[PDB]
Design a protein around this ligand. Structure first.
Ligand code: MG
Ligand code: MG
Ligand code: MG
Ligand code: MG
Ligand code: MG
Ligand code: MG
Ligand code: MG
Ligand code: MG
Ligand code: MG
Ligand code: MG
Ligand code: MG
Ligand code: MG
Ligand code: MG
Ligand code: MG
Ligand code: MG
Ligand code: MG
Ligand code: MG
Ligand code: MG
Ligand code: MG
Ligand code: MG
Ligand code: MG
Ligand code: MG
Ligand code: MG
Ligand code: MG
Ligand code: MG
Ligand code: MG
Ligand code: MG
Ligand code: MG
Ligand code: MG
Ligand code: MG
Ligand code: MG
Ligand code: MG
Ligand code: MG
Ligand code: MG
Ligand code: MG
Ligand code: MG
Ligand code: MG
Ligand code: MG
Ligand code: MG
Ligand code: MG
Ligand code: MG
Ligand code: MG
Lengths: 67, 144, 60, 260, 185
RNA sequence: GGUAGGAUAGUGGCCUACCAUGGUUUCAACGGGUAACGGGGAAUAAGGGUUCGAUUCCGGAGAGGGAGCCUGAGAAACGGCUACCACAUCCAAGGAAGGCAGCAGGCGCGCAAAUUACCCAAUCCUAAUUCAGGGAGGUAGUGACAAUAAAUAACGAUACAGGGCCCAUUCGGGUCUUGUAAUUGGAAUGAGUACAAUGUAAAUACCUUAACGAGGAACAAUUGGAGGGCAAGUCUGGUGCCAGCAGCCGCGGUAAUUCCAGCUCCAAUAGCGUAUAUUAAAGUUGUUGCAGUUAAAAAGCUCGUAGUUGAACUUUGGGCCCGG
RNA sequence: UCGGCACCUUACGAGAAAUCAAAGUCUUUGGGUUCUGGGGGGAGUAUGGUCGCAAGGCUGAAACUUAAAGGAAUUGACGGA
């Protein structure tokens, strides 16, 4: 079997230069509990509709369509 | 001196004469005038789908004595009416009145084949279920 | 060129042809072993070499 | 269309970068800089595809953002920085200094140099002009502007640039007898000094160059870089001394140097 | 957008589909060498067509031409190395005289039979295909392998894959397990 | 085309003013057609050629159609705006919003073309930026577009072909078994199934590998043919100028080598057939390289302009040296 | 002797042959140049243009159809030769 090997000078430099997926493979980084890519893109495009923080938008909606 | 000009500066006369005389061939004439896209019911295509209008019985040319079992077909893409031979024993029982046939050419690029007068096309599929497969045992024709 | 011949007989001979099922037989080998079988029947142990050779002799 | 292109297709990259055909649709487009797009070598091609020090482009970025590399004295943390001919790349770790010179097949070879030779570079004078307030300058082949040159410095000469201050130490004229390194065309990477120079008013002055095995070749004047006098070049020379052996001599050498 | 992937057809069919002489000759070839197909003859004919066309355009070049010497010597060296052209006979007008049987003799399926080890070409084919014979210590299961005259001494049975040792084998193990089931323990 | 001006980033009839009468064209202008984006290239060809190039790279143009513009270094931008035209969506009828020739997907059109998947790990790009973003791109799915390699068996004993020995005399002798016993024996292996590992961003698949995994090894190879061209049948049954076949020549009207079948045989083979287009074959476009008395074809005859073509002639010879 | 209308013999040669001193000097294929033809029909038709008083001329297709049409010679058969 033929492959490629890296031995870093220390484990701090291993964590610093080693890619995140290899550190997840070796146990030196946790896999992130991120969302799917289409959900992330849809959330971003939803946030593109809002200008400002939107607290005034939420309070104006809850004022106009409650009575 | 063999009729054509030979000189080093006669390439204009040679090429213009070749361009003029090239028109006398069948294929160059047909390709350059766009005959397949103006004439030729299969308007440049290899196959064409059409709707069966009628089952015809064509009497074969002499010295052959047979009825040839063709169909009259209106092409869907074009509206032109063509006559198409239904090739095998039986297989005119498989067509129907008024359903869908895929048609192809008939071997000789125009130019009706054999003893069959005026028929330049054959039926390849009917109802999209392939007359060879219908004829052997392979697939069953859909009822609707 | 008459286009209204009778279509009553379409399929006549194939519809009245007697049905014979294909005879069940041993399989023939495929590929390299079939070309091996062809080579033994044609160039190694051929005996029907009347004139040059024959391949499908009928009853004489 | 509509503005400057920012991408470079692979198979539209220069052939001397020796990029593999597969493993990407895109080649690293060289940034604007001292050298041209096609006459140069990006730092990612030098650090990943020549020295093999990095496996990715992300490792080239991780090397460069630690300020280890420097081109011509300054640090250059740009990944696609156009390092071209005569440029000196200093990698501080392993104390390596490189001068980008052509090997005689026409490609940028890895040529390790010393710290003395890394102190300077050579620049072919592209123009000599007066700037404003009457100050004269020369413009070299790598976009450097050097004020107050020697008045003997003309076009197609070669100045030596001190690279700690961008100053002209000495210079070499263009006249019959002195070495020529060839930096373009199909004689790219060759050496051999002279036969003469023919003028051709209107365009494309030609130089006849005859190497140490007495093979003449003509090159355009714009592809001609003076590196010194005949013997003792002002730079070190790469593996081969710019000879361009033919393919039979190449095979007669390669069969020899594999059976010990 | 990507680099296109180059591919080439490796054979040519004859222009005449039914010639009794050619069909007899190719069935004779496939019986002598144990071939699956006419395609395996057509590939060798394609390779000879390319070799002969290359040697022909070199032979019309004047002798002591640089391209003639370089490419002709490279062609001769490749054919000598693969064993089709002998270790004498290093001329371009003798590689025009090459035929199909020379390449068919150099196959791994022919070499495995020729160097003992197989007892037939049809046994050689199914020794090779069945992950037996190793050419270095490399298992090859390709019968069209073109043994290169310095691998001939190293063609043997594999370190794995019995007839080479280190384990009995699938139906031997099952049958011995059945005889252990029946007879003893 | 000249002069001057205006405009432009700048040259310029680019526009304007005033002049002059030019500019192009049988060496094909101008006009018409193109089922024309151009090129690198592709198929095929002894050589010369013929045909194709929407399509991975390069250049151009476009973003339903036209036009106009803002911003900006750069756009006459369309995942920017404005108007008109066409089409079309929501609506409380007041109004408001639109542009898949991006990716996926749908409808329609048709002979004719795939998932509303996963990811920025690679290649690169952009940003204030090592970090974010990227349907660019990559990964898989669908995929007989095309291409590469090559399973579907192999080997022995019981039976028989004879190539035989010393004149096997009449078959024994330590002969020598390829075809036949829908016999007989054990071996071999991957298709598949999967422990794991490796793979990979994560997977899948490959490669490796534990245990499984063939006797009708049903773990059953097909597609076209069997008159000629053109390899393979005057075999049997059916039909009886019908039905049908047949590229072409032809077969069928009661013994069909050709139809429909069965048996057997042939060819290519995980492929094979059909239709169309094109190349070779085609020296049937002929420059190489056709033909013109009679097969198609010397203008009725002569003049004549462009075109094509056009007699001979001008420093030859001798000697010497270096010299690859 | 030059020039002309031709003829006769031979086949060096040419041709599919009849025949041909040109229909030769052609696969051993290039002296110069013009025009014409590309299987048979449809068809010298339709249409457009142009000339003519007109009759017509000159230029001139296609759809569609077809497996031969033709040339020369041989043998036969036939002829109100
Ligand atoms: Mg001339
Ligand atoms: Mg015989
Ligand atoms: Mg663009
Ligand atoms: Mg860039
Ligand atoms: Mg194994
Ligand atoms: Mg002015
Ligand atoms: Mg002006
Ligand atoms: Mg003016
Ligand atoms: Mg002009
Ligand atoms: Mg177009
Ligand atoms: Mg193109
Ligand atoms: Mg194109
Ligand atoms: Mg188009
Ligand atoms: Mg645009
Ligand atoms: Mg649209
Ligand atoms: Mg901006
Ligand atoms: Mg726009
Ligand atoms: Mg859009
Ligand atoms: Mg855009
Ligand atoms: Mg789409
Ligand atoms: Mg894409
Ligand atoms: Mg399709
Ligand atoms: Mg879909
Ligand atoms: Mg990425
Ligand atoms: Mg996409
Ligand atoms: Mg199978
Ligand atoms: Mg394995
Ligand atoms: Mg049959
Ligand atoms: Mg035959
Ligand atoms: Mg037949
Ligand atoms: Mg030819
Ligand atoms: Mg002809
Ligand atoms: Mg005639
Ligand atoms: Mg005539
Ligand atoms: Mg005349
Ligand atoms: Mg004249
Ligand atoms: Mg002259
Ligand atoms: Mg002759
Ligand atoms: Mg013709
Ligand atoms: Mg004709
Ligand atoms: Mg008329
Ligand atoms: Mg006659």
């Amino acid at each position: 079997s033929v492959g490629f090997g890296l031995v870093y000078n220390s484990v701090a430099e291993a964590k610093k230069f080693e890619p995140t997926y290899r550190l997840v493979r070796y146990g030196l980084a946790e896999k992130v509990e991120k969302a799917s890519r289409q959900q992330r893109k849809q959330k971003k495009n939803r946030d593109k509709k809002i200008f400002g923080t939107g607290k005034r938008l939420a309070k104006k909606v809850a004022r106009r369509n409650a009575d | 001196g063999k009729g054509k000009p030979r000189g080093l500066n006669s390439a204009r006369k040679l090429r213009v004469h070749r361009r003029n005389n090239r028109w006398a061939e069948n294929n160059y004439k047909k390709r350059l005038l766009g005959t397949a896209f103006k004439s030729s019911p299969f308007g440049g295509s290899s196959h064409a789908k059409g709707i069966v209008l009628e089952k015809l019985g064509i009497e074969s040319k002499q010295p052959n004595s047979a009825i040839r079992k063709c169909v009259r077909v209106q092409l869907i893409k074009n509206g032109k009416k063509v006559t198409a031979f239904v090739p095998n024993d039986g297989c005119l029982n498989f067509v129907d009145e008024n359903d869908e046939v895929l048609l192809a050419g008939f071997g000789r690029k125009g130019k009706a084949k054999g003893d069959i007068p005026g028929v330049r096309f054959k039926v390849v599929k009917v109802s999209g279920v392939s007359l060879l497969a219908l004829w052997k045992e392979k697939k069953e024709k859909p009822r609707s | 060129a008459k286009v209204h011949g009778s279509l009553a007989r379409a399929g006549k001979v194939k519809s009245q042809t007697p049905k014979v099922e294909k005879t069940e037989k041993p399989k023939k080998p495929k590929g390299r072993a079939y070309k091996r079988l062809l080579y033994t029947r044609r160039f190694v142990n051929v005996t029907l070499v009347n004139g040059k050779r024959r391949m499908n002799p009928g009853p004489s | 269309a509509r503005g400057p292109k920012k991408h470079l297709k692979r198979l539209a990259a220069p052939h001397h970068w020796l990029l593999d055909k597969l493993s990407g649709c895109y080649a690293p487009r060289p940034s604007a800089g001292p050298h041209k797009l096609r006459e140069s070598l990006p730092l990612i091609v030098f650090l990943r595809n020549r020295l093999k020090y990095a496996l990715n482009g992300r490792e080239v970025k991780a090397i460069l953002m630690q300020r280890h590399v420097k081109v011509d004295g300054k640090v250059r943390t740009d990944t696609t920085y156009p390092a071209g001919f005569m440029d000196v790349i200093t990698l501080d770790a392993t104390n390596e200094n490189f001068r980008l010179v052509y090997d005689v097949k026409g490609r940028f070879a890895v040529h390790r140099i010393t710290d003395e030779e890394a102190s300077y570079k050579l620049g072919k004078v592209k123009k000599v002009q007066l700037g404003k307030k009457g100050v004269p300058y020369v413009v070299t082949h790598d976009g450097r502007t050097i004020r107050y040159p020697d008045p003997n410095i003309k076009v197609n000469d070669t100045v030596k640039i001190d690279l700690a201050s961008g100053k002209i130490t000495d210079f070499i004229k263009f006249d019959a007898g002195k070495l020529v390194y060839v930096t373009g065309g199909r004689n790219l990477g060759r050496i051999g000094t002279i036969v003469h120079k023919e003028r051709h008013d209107g365009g494309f002055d030609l130089v006849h160059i005859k190497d140490s095995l007495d093979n003449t070749f003509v090159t355009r004047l714009n592809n001609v870089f003076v590196i010194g006098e005949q013997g003792k070049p002002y730079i070190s020379l790469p593996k081969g001394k710019g000879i361009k052996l033919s393919i039979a001599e190449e095979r007669d050498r390669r069969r020899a140097q594999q059976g010990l | 957008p990507r680099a296109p992937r180059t591919y080439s057809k490796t054979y040519s069919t004859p222009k005449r589909p039914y010639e009794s002489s050619r069909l007899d000759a190719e069935l004779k070839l496939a019986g002598e060498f144990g071939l699956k197909n006419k395609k395996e003859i057509y590939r060798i004919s394609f390779q000879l067509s390319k070799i002969r066309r290359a040697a022909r355009d070199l032979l019309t070049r004047d002798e002591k031409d640089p391209k003639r010497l370089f490419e002709g010597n490279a062609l001769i060296r490749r054919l000598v190395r693969v064993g089709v052209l002998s270790e004498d006979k290093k001329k371009l007008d003798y590689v025009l005289a090459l035929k199909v049987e020379d390449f068919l003799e150099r196959r791994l399926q022919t070499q495995v039979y020729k160097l003992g080890l197989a007892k037939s070409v049809h046994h050689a084919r199914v020794l090779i295909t069945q992950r037996h014979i190793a050419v270095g210590k490399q298992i090859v299961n390709i019968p069209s392998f073109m043994v290169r005259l310095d691998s001939e001494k190293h063609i043997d049975f594999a370190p794995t894959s019995p007839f080479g040792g280190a384990r009995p084998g699938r139906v031997a193990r099952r049958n011995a397990a059945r005889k252990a089931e029946a007879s003893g323990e």
